[PDB]
Every structure is written in structure tokens, then in C-alpha cells.
Short mmCIF file of N, CA and C in Angstrom, two decimals:
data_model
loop_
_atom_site.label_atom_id
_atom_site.label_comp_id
_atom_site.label_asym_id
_atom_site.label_seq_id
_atom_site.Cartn_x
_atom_site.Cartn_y
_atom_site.Cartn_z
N UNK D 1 29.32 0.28 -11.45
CA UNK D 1 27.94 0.34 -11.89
C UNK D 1 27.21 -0.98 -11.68
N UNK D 2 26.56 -1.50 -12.57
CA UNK D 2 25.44 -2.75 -12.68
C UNK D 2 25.12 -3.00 -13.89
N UNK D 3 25.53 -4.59 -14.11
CA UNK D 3 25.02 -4.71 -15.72
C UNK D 3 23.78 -4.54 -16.14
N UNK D 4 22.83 -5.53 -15.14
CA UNK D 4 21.65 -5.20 -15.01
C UNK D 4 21.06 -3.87 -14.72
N UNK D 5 20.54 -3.39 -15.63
CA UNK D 5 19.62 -1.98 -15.50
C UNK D 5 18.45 -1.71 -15.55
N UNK D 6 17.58 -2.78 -15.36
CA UNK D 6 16.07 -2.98 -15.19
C UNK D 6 15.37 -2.76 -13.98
N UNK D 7 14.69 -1.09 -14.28
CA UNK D 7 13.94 -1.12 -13.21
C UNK D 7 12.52 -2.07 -12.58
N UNK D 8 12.43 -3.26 -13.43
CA UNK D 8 11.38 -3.55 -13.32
C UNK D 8 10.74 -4.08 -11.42
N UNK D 9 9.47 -3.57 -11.66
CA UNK D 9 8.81 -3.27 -10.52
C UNK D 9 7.67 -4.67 -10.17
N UNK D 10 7.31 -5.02 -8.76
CA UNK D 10 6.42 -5.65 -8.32
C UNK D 10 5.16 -5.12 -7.93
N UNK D 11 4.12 -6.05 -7.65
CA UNK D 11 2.49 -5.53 -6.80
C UNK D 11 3.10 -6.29 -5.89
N UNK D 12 1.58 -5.41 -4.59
CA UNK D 12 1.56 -6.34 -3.50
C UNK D 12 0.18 -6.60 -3.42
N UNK D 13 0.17 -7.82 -3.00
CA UNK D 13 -1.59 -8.21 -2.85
C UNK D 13 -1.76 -8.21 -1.38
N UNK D 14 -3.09 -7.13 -0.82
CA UNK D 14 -3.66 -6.83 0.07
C UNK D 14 -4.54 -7.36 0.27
N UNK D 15 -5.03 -8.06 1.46
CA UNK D 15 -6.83 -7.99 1.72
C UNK D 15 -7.44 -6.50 2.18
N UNK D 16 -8.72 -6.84 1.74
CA UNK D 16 -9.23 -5.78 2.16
C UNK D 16 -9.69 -5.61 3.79
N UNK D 17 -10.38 -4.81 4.52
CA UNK D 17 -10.55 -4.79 5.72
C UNK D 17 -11.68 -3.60 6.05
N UNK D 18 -12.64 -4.45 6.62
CA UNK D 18 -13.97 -3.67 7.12
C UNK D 18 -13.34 -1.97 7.88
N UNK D 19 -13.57 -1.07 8.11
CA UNK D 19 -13.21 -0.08 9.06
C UNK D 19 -14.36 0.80 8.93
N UNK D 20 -15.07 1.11 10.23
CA UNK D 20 -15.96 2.12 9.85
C UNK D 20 -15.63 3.56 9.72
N UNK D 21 -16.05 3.96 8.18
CA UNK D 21 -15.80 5.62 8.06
C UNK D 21 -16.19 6.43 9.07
N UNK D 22 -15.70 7.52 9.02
CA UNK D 22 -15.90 8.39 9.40
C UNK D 22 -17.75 8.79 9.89
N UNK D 23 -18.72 8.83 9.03
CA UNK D 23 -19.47 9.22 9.40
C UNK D 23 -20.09 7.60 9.74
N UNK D 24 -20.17 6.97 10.42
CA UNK D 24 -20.10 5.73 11.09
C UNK D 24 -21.01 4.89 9.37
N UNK D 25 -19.66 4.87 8.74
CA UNK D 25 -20.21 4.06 7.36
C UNK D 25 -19.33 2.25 7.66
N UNK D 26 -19.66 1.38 7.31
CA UNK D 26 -19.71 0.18 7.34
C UNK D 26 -18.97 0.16 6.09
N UNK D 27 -17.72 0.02 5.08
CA UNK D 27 -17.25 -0.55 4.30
C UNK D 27 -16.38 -1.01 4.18
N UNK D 28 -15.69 -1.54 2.48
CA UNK D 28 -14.76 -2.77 2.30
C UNK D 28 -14.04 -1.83 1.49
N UNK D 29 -12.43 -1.48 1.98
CA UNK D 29 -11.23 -0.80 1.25
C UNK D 29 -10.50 -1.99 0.82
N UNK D 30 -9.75 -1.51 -0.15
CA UNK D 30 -8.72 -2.49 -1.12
C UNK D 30 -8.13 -2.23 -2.06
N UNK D 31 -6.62 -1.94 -1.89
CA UNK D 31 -5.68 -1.27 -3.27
C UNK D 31 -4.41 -2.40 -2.87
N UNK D 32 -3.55 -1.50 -4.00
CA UNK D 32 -2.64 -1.69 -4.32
C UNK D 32 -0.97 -1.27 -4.55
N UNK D 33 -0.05 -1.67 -4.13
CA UNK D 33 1.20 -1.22 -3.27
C UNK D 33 2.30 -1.69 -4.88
N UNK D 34 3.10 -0.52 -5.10
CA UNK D 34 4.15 -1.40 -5.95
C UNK D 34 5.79 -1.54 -5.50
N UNK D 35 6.05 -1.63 -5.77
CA UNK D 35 7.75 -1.51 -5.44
C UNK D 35 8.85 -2.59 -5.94
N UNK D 36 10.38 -1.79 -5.67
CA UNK D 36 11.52 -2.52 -6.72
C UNK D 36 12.60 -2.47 -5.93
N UNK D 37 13.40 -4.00 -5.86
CA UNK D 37 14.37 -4.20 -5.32
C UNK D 37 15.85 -3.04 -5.87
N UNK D 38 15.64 -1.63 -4.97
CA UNK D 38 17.22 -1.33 -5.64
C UNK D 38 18.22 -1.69 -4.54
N UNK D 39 17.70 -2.38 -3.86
CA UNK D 39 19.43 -2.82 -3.03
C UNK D 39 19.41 -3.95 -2.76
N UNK D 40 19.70 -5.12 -3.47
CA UNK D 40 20.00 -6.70 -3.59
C UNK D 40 20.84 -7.06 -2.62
N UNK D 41 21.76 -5.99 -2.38
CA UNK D 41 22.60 -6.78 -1.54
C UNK D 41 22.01 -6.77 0.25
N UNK D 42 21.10 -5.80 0.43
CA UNK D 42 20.29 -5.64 1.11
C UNK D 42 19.08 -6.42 1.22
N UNK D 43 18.59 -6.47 0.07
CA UNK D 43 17.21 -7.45 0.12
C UNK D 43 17.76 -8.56 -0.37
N UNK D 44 18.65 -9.03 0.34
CA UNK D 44 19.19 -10.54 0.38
C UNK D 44 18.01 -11.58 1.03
N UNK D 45 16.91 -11.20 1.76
CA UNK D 45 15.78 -11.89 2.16
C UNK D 45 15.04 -12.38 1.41
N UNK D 46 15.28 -12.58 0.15
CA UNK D 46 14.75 -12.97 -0.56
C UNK D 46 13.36 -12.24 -1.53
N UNK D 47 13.10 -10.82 -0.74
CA UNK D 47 11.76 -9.94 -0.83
C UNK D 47 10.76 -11.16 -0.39
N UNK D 48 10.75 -11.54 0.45
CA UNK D 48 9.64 -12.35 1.12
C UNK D 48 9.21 -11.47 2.75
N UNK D 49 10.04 -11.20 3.94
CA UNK D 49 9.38 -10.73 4.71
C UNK D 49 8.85 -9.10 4.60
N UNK D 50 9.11 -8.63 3.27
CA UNK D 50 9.08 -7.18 2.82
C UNK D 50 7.25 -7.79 2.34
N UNK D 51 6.84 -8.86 1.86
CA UNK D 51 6.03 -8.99 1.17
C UNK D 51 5.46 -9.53 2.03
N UNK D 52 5.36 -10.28 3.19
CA UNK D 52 4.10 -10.40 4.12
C UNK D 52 4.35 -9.29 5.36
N UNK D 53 5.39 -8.05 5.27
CA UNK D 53 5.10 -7.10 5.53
C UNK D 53 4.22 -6.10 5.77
N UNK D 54 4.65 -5.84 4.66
CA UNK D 54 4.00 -4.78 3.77
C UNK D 54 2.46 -4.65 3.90
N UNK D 55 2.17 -5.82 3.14
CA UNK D 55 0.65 -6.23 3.94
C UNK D 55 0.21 -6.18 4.79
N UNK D 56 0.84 -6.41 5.75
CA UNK D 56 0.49 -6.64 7.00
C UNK D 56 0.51 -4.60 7.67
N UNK D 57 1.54 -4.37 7.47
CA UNK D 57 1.44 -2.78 7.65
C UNK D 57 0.46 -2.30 7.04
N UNK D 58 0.16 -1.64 5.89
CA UNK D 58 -0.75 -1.12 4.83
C UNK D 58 -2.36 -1.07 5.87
N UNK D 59 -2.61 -2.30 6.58
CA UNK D 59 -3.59 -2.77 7.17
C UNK D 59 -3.36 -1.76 7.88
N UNK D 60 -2.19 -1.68 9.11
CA UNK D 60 -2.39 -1.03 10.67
C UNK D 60 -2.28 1.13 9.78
N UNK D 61 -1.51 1.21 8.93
CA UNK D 61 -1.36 2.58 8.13
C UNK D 61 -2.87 2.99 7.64
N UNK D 62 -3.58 2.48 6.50
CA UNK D 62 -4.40 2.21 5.79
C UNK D 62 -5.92 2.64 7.13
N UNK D 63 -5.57 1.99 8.24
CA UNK D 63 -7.11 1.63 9.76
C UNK D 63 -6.50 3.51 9.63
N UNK D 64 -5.73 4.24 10.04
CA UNK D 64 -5.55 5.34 10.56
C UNK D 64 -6.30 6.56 9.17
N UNK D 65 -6.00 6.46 7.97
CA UNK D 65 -6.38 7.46 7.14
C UNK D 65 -7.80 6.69 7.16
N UNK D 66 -7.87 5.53 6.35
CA UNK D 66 -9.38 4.98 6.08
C UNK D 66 -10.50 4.74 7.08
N UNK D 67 -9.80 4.59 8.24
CA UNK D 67 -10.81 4.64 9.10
C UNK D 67 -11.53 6.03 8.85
N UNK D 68 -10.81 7.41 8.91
CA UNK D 68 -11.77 8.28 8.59
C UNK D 68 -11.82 9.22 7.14
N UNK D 69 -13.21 9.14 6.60
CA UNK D 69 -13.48 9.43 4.91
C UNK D 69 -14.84 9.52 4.40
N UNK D 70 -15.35 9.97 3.89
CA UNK D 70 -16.80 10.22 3.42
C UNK D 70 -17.42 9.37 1.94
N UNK D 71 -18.03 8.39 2.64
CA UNK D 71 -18.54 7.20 1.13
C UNK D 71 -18.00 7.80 -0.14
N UNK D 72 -18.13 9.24 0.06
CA UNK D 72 -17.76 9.71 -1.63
C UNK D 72 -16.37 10.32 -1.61
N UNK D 73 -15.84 11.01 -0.76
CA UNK D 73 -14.87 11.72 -0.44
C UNK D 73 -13.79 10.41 -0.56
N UNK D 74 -14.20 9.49 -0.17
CA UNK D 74 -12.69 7.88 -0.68
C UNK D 74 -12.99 7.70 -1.92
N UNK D 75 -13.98 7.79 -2.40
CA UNK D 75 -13.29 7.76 -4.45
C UNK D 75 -12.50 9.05 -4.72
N UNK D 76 -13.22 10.04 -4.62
CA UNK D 76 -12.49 11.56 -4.73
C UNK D 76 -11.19 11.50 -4.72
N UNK D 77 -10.74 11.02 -2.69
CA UNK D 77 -9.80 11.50 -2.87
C UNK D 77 -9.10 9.79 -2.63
N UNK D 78 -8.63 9.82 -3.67
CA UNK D 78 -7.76 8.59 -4.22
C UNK D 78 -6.06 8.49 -4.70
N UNK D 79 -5.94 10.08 -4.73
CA UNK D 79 -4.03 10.34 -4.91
C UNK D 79 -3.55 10.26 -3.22
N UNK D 80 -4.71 10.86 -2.56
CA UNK D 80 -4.08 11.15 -1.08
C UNK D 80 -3.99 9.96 -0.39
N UNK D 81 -4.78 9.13 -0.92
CA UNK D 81 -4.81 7.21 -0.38
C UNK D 81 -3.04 6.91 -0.66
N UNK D 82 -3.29 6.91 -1.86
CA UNK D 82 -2.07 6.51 -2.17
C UNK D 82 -0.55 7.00 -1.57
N UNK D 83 -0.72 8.25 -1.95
CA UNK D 83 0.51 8.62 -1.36
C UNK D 83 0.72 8.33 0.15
N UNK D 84 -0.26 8.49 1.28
CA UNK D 84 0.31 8.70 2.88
C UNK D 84 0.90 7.01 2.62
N UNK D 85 -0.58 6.25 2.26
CA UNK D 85 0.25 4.64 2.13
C UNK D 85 2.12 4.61 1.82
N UNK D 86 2.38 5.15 0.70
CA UNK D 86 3.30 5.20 -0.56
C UNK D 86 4.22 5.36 0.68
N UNK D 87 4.05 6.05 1.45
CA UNK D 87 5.05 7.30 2.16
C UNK D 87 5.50 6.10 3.64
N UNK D 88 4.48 6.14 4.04
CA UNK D 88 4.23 4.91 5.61
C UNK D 88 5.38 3.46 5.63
N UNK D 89 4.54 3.39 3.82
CA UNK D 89 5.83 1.99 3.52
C UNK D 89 6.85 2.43 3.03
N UNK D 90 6.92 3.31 2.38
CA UNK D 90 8.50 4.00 1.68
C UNK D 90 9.40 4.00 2.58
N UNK D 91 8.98 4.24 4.45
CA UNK D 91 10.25 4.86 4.98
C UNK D 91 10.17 3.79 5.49
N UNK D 92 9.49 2.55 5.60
CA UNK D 92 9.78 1.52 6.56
C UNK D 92 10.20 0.29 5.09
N UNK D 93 10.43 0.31 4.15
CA UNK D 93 11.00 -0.36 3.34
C UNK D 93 12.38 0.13 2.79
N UNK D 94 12.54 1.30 2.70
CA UNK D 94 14.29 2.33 2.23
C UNK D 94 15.11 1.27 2.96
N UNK D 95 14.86 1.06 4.31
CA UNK D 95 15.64 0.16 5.30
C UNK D 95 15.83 -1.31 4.71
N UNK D 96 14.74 -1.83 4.25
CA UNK D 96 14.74 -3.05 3.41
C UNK D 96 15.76 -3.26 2.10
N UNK D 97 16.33 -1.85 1.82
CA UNK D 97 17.14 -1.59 0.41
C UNK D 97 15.31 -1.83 -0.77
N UNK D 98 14.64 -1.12 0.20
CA UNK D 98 13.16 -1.63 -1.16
C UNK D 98 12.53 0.10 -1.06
N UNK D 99 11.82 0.44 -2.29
CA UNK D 99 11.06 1.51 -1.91
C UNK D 99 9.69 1.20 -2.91
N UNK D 100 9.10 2.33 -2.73
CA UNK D 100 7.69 2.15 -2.99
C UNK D 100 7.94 3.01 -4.38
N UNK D 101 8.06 1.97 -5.45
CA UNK D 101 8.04 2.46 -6.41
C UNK D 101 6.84 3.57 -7.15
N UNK D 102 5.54 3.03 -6.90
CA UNK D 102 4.36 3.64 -7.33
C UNK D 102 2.74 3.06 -6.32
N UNK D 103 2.13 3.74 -5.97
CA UNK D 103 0.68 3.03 -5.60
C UNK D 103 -0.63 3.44 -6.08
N UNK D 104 -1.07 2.35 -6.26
CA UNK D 104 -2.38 2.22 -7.19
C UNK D 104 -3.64 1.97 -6.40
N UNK D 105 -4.69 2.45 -6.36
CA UNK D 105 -6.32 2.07 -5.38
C UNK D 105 -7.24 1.20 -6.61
N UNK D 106 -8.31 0.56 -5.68
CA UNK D 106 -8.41 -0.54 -6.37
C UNK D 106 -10.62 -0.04 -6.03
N UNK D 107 -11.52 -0.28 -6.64
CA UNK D 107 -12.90 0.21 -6.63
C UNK D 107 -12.69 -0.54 -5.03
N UNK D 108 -14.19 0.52 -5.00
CA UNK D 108 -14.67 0.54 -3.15
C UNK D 108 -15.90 -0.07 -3.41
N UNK D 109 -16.03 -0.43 -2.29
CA UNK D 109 -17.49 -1.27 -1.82
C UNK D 109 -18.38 -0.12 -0.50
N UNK D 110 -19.26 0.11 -0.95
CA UNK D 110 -20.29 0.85 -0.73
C UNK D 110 -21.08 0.25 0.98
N UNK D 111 -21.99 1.17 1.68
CA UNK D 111 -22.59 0.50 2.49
C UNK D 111 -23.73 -0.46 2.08
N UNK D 112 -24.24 -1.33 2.30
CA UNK D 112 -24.85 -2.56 1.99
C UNK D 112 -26.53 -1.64 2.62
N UNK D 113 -27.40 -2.33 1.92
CA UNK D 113 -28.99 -1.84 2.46
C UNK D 113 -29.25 -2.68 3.54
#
């Protein structure tokens, strides 16, 4: 087994990134990624290249759904953000011994006048 039995979990901090919506809208997306080391002997990297990863993916994952969405239809739909993200990094972190514990969206920025 493991003495330690703490699932405790991390964030990841994202920038946000211009992409124009769908109906050629101009805005600023920005959430939030969680996840928990269950394989140490695996994430012997210290969880450092998982963490300028991650980020760095979320961006190229994140351009494909967010690029297309309706000013209102990205608050709406805010479980489906999460999850494809959740899912994109889940299978490219399992490999890391890391998974995507939970993901969280963070308020949107609107088109500007």
C-alpha cells in the first residue's frame, strides 16, 4: 500500500489567449486545470515539465474548441469547456503518472466597443 493517503490536489495557472469566436467575435478565454500526483515514482520530474506543459497544451487544445462558440453560448456552456480540456490533458498526463483531477473555468471577457 502507501502510508501516505492524501489525495491532495494542485491548480494550473494559464494565460489567457485572444481567439476569434466563432461568429468572428474578438475575445479573452481563461480557466483553470487541476490535478494530483498518483504516480511519484513516475512523476519523479519533479511535476515541473507537467506544469509548463500543461499550459502550454490547454493553449494549442483550448484554440480548437474556443476558437469556435457564441459570446453567450461560452458562459452557457462551461461543463463542456471543461471536460474536452479535462480529457486532452488527462490522456497526455496518465503517461506523466499525473491525471486531471478536476477543471474549473474562470469569467470571460466580452467583445470591447
Amino acid at each position: 500500500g502507501s502510508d501516505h493517503v492524501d489525495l491532495r490536489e494542485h491548480v494550473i495557472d494559464v494565460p489567457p489567449q485572444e481567439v476569434i469566436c466563432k461568429d468572428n467575435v474578438v475575445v479573452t478565454v481563461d480557466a483553470v486545470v487541476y490535478y494530483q500526483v498518483i504516480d511519484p515514482v513516475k512523476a519523479v520530474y519533479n511535476v515541473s515539465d507537467f506544469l509548463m506543459a500543461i499550459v502550454k497544451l490547454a493553449q494549442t487544445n483550448l484554440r480548437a474548441i474556443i476558437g469556435e462558440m457564441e459570446l453567450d453560448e461560452t458562459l452557457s456552456g462551461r461543463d463542456i469547456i471543461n471536460a474536452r480540456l479535462r480529457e486532452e490533458l488527462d490522456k497526455i498526463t496518465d503517461r506523466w503518472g499525473v491525471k486531471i483531477t478536476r477543471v474549473e473555468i474562470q469569467r470571460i471577457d466580452p467583445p470591447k466597443d
